[PDB]
Amino acid sequence: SEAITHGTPFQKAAALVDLAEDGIGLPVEILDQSSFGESARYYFIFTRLDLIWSLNYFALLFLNFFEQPLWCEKNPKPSCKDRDYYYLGELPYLTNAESIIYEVITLAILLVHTFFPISYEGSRIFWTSRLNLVKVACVVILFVDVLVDFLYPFRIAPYVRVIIFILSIRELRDTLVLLSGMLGTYLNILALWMLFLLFASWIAFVMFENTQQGLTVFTSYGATLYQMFILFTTSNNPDVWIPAYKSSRWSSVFFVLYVLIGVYFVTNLILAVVYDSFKEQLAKQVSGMDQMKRRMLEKAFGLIDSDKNGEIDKNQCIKLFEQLTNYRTLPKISKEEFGLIFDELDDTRDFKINKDEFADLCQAIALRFQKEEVPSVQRYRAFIATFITLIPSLMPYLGTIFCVLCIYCSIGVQVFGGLVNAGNKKLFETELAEDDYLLFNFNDYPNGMVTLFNLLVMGNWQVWMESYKDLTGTWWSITYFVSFYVITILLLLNLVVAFVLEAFFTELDLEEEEKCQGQDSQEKRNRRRSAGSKSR
Amino acid sequence: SEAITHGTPFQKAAALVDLAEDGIGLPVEILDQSSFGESARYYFIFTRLDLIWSLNYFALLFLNFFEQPLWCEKNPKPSCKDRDYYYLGELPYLTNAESIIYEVITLAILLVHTFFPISYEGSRIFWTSRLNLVKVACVVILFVDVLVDFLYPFRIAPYVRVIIFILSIRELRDTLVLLSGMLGTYLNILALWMLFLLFASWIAFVMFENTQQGLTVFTSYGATLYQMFILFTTSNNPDVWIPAYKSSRWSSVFFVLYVLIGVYFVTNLILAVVYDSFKEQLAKQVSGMDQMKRRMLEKAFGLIDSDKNGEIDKNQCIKLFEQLTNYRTLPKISKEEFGLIFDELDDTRDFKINKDEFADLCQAIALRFQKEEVPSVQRYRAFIATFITLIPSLMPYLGTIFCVLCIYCSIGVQVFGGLVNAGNKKLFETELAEDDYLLFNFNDYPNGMVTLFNLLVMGNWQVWMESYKDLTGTWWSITYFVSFYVITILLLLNLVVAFVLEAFFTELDLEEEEKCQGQDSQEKRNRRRSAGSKSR
Ligand SMILES: CCCCCCCCCCCCCCCCCC(=O)OC[C@H](COP(=O)(O)O)OC(=O)CCCCCCCCCCCCCCCCC
Ligand SMILES: CCCCCCCCCCCCCCCCCC(=O)OC[C@H](COP(=O)(O)O)OC(=O)CCCCCCCCCCCCCCCCC
Ligand SMILES: CCCCCCCCCCCCCCCC(=O)O
Ligand SMILES: CCCCCCCCCCCCCCCC(=O)O
Ligand SMILES: CCCCCCCCCCCCCCCC(=O)O
Ligand SMILES: CCCCCCCCCCCCCCCC(=O)O
Ligand SMILES: CCCCCCCCCCCCCCCC(=O)O
Ligand SMILES: CCCCCCCCCCCCCCCC(=O)O
Ligand SMILES: CCCCCCCCCCCCCCCC(=O)O
Ligand SMILES: CCCCCCCCCCCCCCCC(=O)O
Ligand SMILES: CCCCCCCCCCCCCCCC(=O)O
Ligand SMILES: CCCCCCCCCCCCCCCC(=O)O
Ligand SMILES: CCCCCCCCCCCCCCCC(=O)O
Ligand SMILES: CCCCCCCCCCCCCCCC(=O)O
Ligand SMILES: CCCCCCCCCCCCCCCC(=O)O
Ligand SMILES: CCCCCCCCCCCCCCCC(=O)O
Ligand SMILES: [Ca+2]
Ligand SMILES: [Ca+2]
Ligand SMILES: [Ca+2]
Ligand SMILES: [Ca+2]
Ligand SMILES: [Ca+2]
Ligand SMILES: [Ca+2]
Ligand SMILES: [Ca+2]
Numbered sequence A, B: 001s002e003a004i005t006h007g008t009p010f011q012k013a014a015a016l017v018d019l020a021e022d023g024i025g026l027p028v029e030i031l032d033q034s035s036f037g038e039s040a041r042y043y044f045i046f047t048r049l050d051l052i053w054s055l056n057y058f059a060l061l062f063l064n065f066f067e068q069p070l071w072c073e074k075n076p077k078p079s080c081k082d083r084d085y086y087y088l089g090e091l092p093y094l095t096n097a098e099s100i101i102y103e104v105i106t107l108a109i110l111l112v113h114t115f116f117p118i119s120y121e122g123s124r125i126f127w128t129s130r131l132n133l134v135k136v137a138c139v140v141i142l143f144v145d146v147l148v149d150f151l152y153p154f155r156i157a158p159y160v161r162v163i164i165f166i167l168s169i170r171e172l173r174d175t176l177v178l179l180s181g182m183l184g185t186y187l188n189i190l191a192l193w194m195l196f197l198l199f200a201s202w203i204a205f206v207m208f209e210n211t212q213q214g215l216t217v218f219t220s221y222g223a224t225l226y227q228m229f230i231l232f233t234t235s236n237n238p239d240v241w242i243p244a245y246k247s248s249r250w251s252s253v254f255f256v257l258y259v260l261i262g263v264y265f266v267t268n269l270i271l272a273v274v275y276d277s278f279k280e281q282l283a284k285q286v287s288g289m290d291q292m293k294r295r296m297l298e299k300a301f302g303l304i305d306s307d308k309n310g311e312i313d314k315n316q317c318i319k320l321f322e323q324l325t326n327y328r329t330l331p332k333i334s335k336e337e338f339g340l341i342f343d344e345l346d347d348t349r350d351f352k353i354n355k356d357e358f359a360d361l362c363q364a365i366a367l368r369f370q371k372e373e374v375p376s377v378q379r380y381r382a383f384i385a386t387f388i389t390l391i392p393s394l395m396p397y398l399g400t401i402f403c404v405l406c407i408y409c410s411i412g413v414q415v416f417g418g419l420v421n422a423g424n425k426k427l428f429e430t431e432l433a434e435d436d437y438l439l440f441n442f443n444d445y446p447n448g449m450v451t452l453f454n455l456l457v458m459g460n461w462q463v464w465m466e467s468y469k470d471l472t473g474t475w476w477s478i479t480y481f482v483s484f485y486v487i488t489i490l491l492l493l494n495l496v497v498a499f500v501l502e503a504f505f506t507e508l509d510l511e512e513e514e515k516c517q518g519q520d521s522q523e524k525r526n527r528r529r530s531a532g533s534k535s536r
Helices: A013-021 A043-052 A054-065 A097-114 A135-152 A162-166 A170-181 A183-206 A222-232 A249-304 A315-324 A331-342 A355-368 A380-395 A399-415 A445-458 A462-471 A478-490 A493-512 A516-518 A527-532 B014-025 B042-052 B054-065 B097-116 B134-151 B158-168 B170-181 B185-206 B222-232 B249-304 B314-323 B330-342 B355-368 B381-393 B399-415 B447-456 B462-471 B475-488 B493-512 B527-532
Strands: none
Touching: A013 A249, A013 A315, A043 A054, A054 A097, A054 A162, A097 A135, A135 A162, A162 A170, A162 A399, A162 B170, A170 A183, A170 A249, A170 A399, A183 A222, A183 A249, A222 A516, A222 B097, A222 B462, A222 B527, A249 A355, A249 A478, A249 A493, A249 B381, A249 B447, A315 A331, A331 A355, A355 B014, A380 B249, A399 A493, A445 A462, A445 A478, A445 A527, A445 B134, A445 B314, A462 A478, A462 A493, A462 B042, A478 A493, A493 A527, A493 B249, B014 B249, B014 B314, B014 B355, B014 B399, B042 B054, B097 B134, B097 B399, B134 B158, B158 B170, B158 B330, B158 B399, B158 B462, B170 B185, B170 B399, B170 B493, B185 B222, B185 B249, B185 B462, B330 B527, B381 B493, B399 B447, B399 B475, B447 B462, B447 B475, B462 B475
């Protein structure tokens, strides 16, 4: 009945479906847990105990990562008029008595989660893992800031509480691999983007240095790199160039052509690269998954074959479909599937004897049958097939961005803290006061979390920018809001706009071939997929 | 020497390069000019005379289509304070004496251009063409409005001066074919977009009706379909939902999730369809060009064969390779290209040619040699290979949109004419006055031409919209500015964003393959293009 616990039995025909199930649904057994001579030791007994308790672990992660909004501003301590909310937010701030209660519970599960794969890896393997020295070093930094906050800089706990949450889920770590391979392409297209703003902030400063434009908005060259940056974003379109329009009507020809080249030529070609870098980096992940599948099926192959000659006979395959617990009657399948597998050796009268034959067989049952069952509108179809596929497909690629904003909030709370006050006199002339944003704030953590969202939508995103270049007084605040743009024109065009285009072309292709596959043959022909995945 | 015209010689050897050149560089011979028994008749003498005078014709089209900005408002005649510019623009308005001078010169050349292919088509063919009746009916409407304006509604000349200009250039007419085939896909994705604003203007009206949101912005349901439409555009992001955030901070979760689903899920999937509809409609145009190329090469085949058995002789191929004027060493090519063409009949040793064999041979010399002589940074390359390709590739697809704006100006001048005055008292409370746009205006034609551009960039595009819902006093002005969105966030996601993605993937497969186009073989194989275009 219950096929959950299996490492302690694991017969020669039963420890197949330990490996043959995990090759289908694609989980991971660790490579140290895979390379054993026995492959059913107390390592593997303790390993599936990690996957049992997994719902405790993610519930710790969102405990640790939703900690930060409930917790105090960096500076209420120098602040005058502390408790009275000057545009703060309605969430409570957990007190110092409430501090050690919430972090020690959080570390009591993180210390279990980090030092658990010692129970199935060697200490020369665990400590030489390099995605796991990172995860241990993140714990010790939290263990400092627990005990420092107990026994009483800028307190780098809330940055580490993100990076633990990034590395601990596989999806957000699998995503972040792509953003390292894409980064060597994106920085070149960033470098030919900055050249576009610089060469066209020069002509916009050459042309208008005499007139009523350069008297008013385009004074210094550093305030035409800055303005023409915001025109590239479109979000300041007619306001930049009214007094160059009002003076000579012909100066729209500069500005209606720069935004035309800027937004409709370059911005699609930053999208084109970051989509074309995605297609190569996604292929490097999927082939990084099939070698994980082939390195599972090769374990399943040699587990059955006793002499390890390199082959398995037909009768030695017939016993597997019953071990699969898949279909009712056995002998009508394996000889039927032999022709269905694209190449049969026919060196013996019955068997096809290779390793690569089985590694395609166990996946060939997967696409067709789905008969395991572990007991424990045509007009609108291609749109809502994708649109419902994309609620869990963009949970990593919109989870990375929610982690990028949990960093910029935590930077942006600290750099830009209790400045929007009720009584800051620079504020009441800014664009925050006149547009009455005066909230969307940065004065706390969740005030900042929303504000980065409006900066992410680009809905009037320069109101916040040009206020904090006047509240902080420096032009160095500009680099907070330019780096949000740059990093999230990868992340909003990689991870989303390139993904939702490819996600449509799957649920197009599954509609364009479902008319073809059901009419081409009664059974599935495998190489049409070999020409179909490389088709577009 | 001079071999420009040569329809009057047109030998068995001279009229071949009449057909063999036009099959390469792809001009058009009309199908009535193609189906003749002689194919060099008194009709064909005049056909190449049409292509000689072609620079007169484009220069007339731009005369006819850049007429409109230089010409008067629809209503200066009821207007008080006529000559004094109340926010008008600096272009002159050509007078009634200047009327008949500029239009009769313009109509002197339409009547040439329209009734010229009578000189190479029958009058039962010219008048049964369904395009060439549209282009005649457009002339007669201009001939009315010339003679009406001479001998002294809304004067539908400026709409026809666009549609003549659309049909007369081939690329703007070739483009507009696609926008009819895409239209049956776009109206469904319009219809499921329209449902998204309706179902989410309902929940935003169910939820916020009691509170300080529905007291202030969300009063009627027609003013939440309207507001949540502008949130879909993002361009009104925090202003809509301040007093539903100021009241409860928890009600950003509605509005930061609706824009997230709106702009990052739907808007990419309207892009995905309109890109996917482009790929099919562009393929239907390119195969509409090869059957035009095959229907030229079959004329070249039938010109050579006097027997018309179905085959041409090899010695006849070689002496017409010489008439091609291609290369200096002739006889080492034809048997060399026999292997280089993917198939050879090989029925006799020399002379066994199919019509499909020659149909690639004339293409075989084209893709490789490029020798005719009509005498008359690795890091950044794939970006600027596209970015320089796209100055003439997006001239049709940004010429259609410049024609869509030349209609909406001409509509939008007439509906919205003299409203923004110096002394309209509704104006000086509107968003046009406070943001001081107040030009961007619609009071003339080129004031309107710019204003549709800012509406096209979406830079604060609702300032104009909510002004004309208060200047015209009705909510029917909204439909002017919602149709500009709907029709041209097709045309800016079809014709640009989908095109610039495909234009990258060509000029990136001419680099990914170009290392293989020099290392795999020194002489080009044709069937890698069968595996290069179908697979990428
Ligand atoms: C604010 C809270 C939002 C709640 C989002 C719900 C996320 C559900 C997570 C439940 C399982 C997570 C395990 C973590 C990753 C490794 C395992 C895996 O491969 O997942 C397979 C899993 C499906 O397989 P199964 O759950 O094992 O059946 O796919 C997923 O749905 C989760 C993928 C990533 C999970 C974390 C990333 C999102 C967190 C950031 C919050 C984003 C807020 C932005 C709002 C957008 C809404 C439109
Ligand atoms: C307001 C002033 C705008 C002036 C812009 C000038 C644009 C130059 C286009 C002149 C060429 C007209 C071709 C005649 C009809 C097409 C036939 C053909 O096969 O063309 C081959 C031609 C190349 O072959 P070739 O010239 O024969 O060597 O392709 C083209 O270059 C033009 C294709 C589109 C046809 C005209 C559409 C443009 C007019 C709308 C103006 C757009 C303003 C928006 C600003 C965008 C700038 C970034
Ligand atoms: C790409 C993702 C963007 C994510 C933007 C994050 C949205 C966070 C907003 C949550 C605000 C919660 C305020 C709590 C108010 C209360 O209950 O008292
Ligand atoms: C393609 C790049 C060309 C444009 C590079 C030009 C930038 C150099 C600086 C221009 C003049 C600086 C204006 C005043 C600066 C100052 O001395 O304070
Ligand atoms: C990526 C290109 C631009 C990115 C960010 C734009 C920054 C340009 C703004 C420079 C500030 C103006 C220089 C200060 C002038 C002064 O000291 O008076
Ligand atoms: C991280 C590097 C990206 C580039 C950042 C800015 C590029 C050059 C810096 C702009 C400052 C130029 C201002 C000099 C002119 C002036 O202020 O008068
Ligand atoms: C992923 C870990 C963090 C990555 C970048 C975070 C740290 C960059 C800036 C954080 C502190 C900078 C603030 C300095 C100015 C100040 O404190 O007044
Ligand atoms: C997840 C990566 C994010 C890290 C990049 C953000 C850091 C860039 C600037 C942070 C603030 C620096 C400017 C502060 C100006 C000031 O001191 O007032
Ligand atoms: C990735 C970030 C891009 C960099 C954006 C530039 C931010 C730096 C500011 C530019 C000019 C400021 C120099 C003047 C200094 C001052 O006035 O205090
Ligand atoms: C997608 C294309 C958008 C096109 C927008 C059209 C720009 C037209 C603006 C031209 C204004 C001409 C006024 C000149 C005044 C004068 O020279 O006297
Ligand atoms: C998926 C579609 C569901 C939403 C459709 C609801 C639209 C019906 C109109 C709602 C009530 C109108 C509100 C007052 C208008 C009036 O009577 O004047
Ligand atoms: C594409 C979806 C909507 C398209 C344009 C939005 C139109 C909704 C606005 C309706 C106006 C309000 C109805 C009038 C109310 C009244 O008479 O008091
Ligand atoms: C061309 C059709 C597209 C749809 C246009 C609008 C869709 C329904 C019309 C909106 C008006 C609904 C207003 C009812 C509520 C009210 O007036 O108070
Ligand atoms: C392609 C030819 C034109 C297509 C659509 C153009 C005509 C639609 C509207 C034109 C006039 C409508 C104005 C009516 C209101 C009024 O005149 O007061
Ligand atoms: C190129 C196609 C464009 C045709 C579509 C535009 C016509 C839709 C509305 C035009 C104005 C209609 C609303 C006018 C309101 C009023 O009378 O004040
Ligand atoms: C394709 C165009 C989309 C249509 C957008 C709707 C345009 C008008 C819809 C709302 C009009 C409100 C009806 C009340 C009329 C009035 O108050 O005068
Ligand atoms: Ca064996
Ligand atoms: Ca067999
Ligand atoms: Ca304002
Ligand atoms: Ca805006
Ligand atoms: Ca013959
Ligand atoms: Ca031969
Ligand atoms: Ca925008």
